[PDB]
DNA sequence: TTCCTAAATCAGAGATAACC
DNA sequence: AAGGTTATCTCTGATTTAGG
């Protein structure tokens, strides 16, 4: 009722509680997935925070520069750095890597 | 407590324009 | 000189947060 955990994945928290063959306890997601391919719910773990994981290195992708003043995004929603942002939204085609330029120049 | 709000801060798209 | 790449500037929107 409160101290039970699915006997498959260890789950102490589901929205509906179901049996397996040996009433035993399966969380919803468990039981479900059991009735539908005959074989236990693989665990598989939740994937990255898109942050406190993903923000641990960022190159462009398509020269993959890692530094650049401001970081934009290609239409597959991909970061991109300023140039090659600049340069497809201007000719609609992919910046050639022969233009890939040494360091960072500044201005003004 | 939890909710809601405010306002900073953050993220990028555009604009502008500096330098080869 | 004029052109073309693309640093910066300008904002609009989305997040993040301290309070009430
Ligand atoms: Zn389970
Ligand atoms: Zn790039």
Redesign the pocket.
């Given at each position: 009722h409160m101290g039970r955990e699915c006997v498959n994945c260890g789950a102490t928290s589901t929205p509906l509680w179901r049996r397996d063959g040996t009433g035993h306890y399966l969380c919803n997601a468990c039981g479900l997935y059991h009735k539908m391919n005959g074989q236990n719910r693989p665990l598989i773990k939740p994937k990255r925070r898109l942050?406190a994981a993903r923000?641990a290195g960022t190159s462009c992708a398509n020269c993959q520069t890692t530094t650049?003043?401001?970081?934009?995004?290609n239409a597959n929603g991909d970061?991109v750095?300023?140039?090659?942002?600049?340069?497809y939204?201007?000719?609609n085609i992919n910046?050639p890597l022969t233009?890939k330029?040494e360091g960072?120049?500044?201005?003004?």
């Open positions: 942050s923000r650049t003043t401001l970081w934009r995004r970061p750095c300023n140039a090659c942002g600049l340069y939204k201007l000719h910046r233009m330029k960072i120049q500044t201005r003004n």
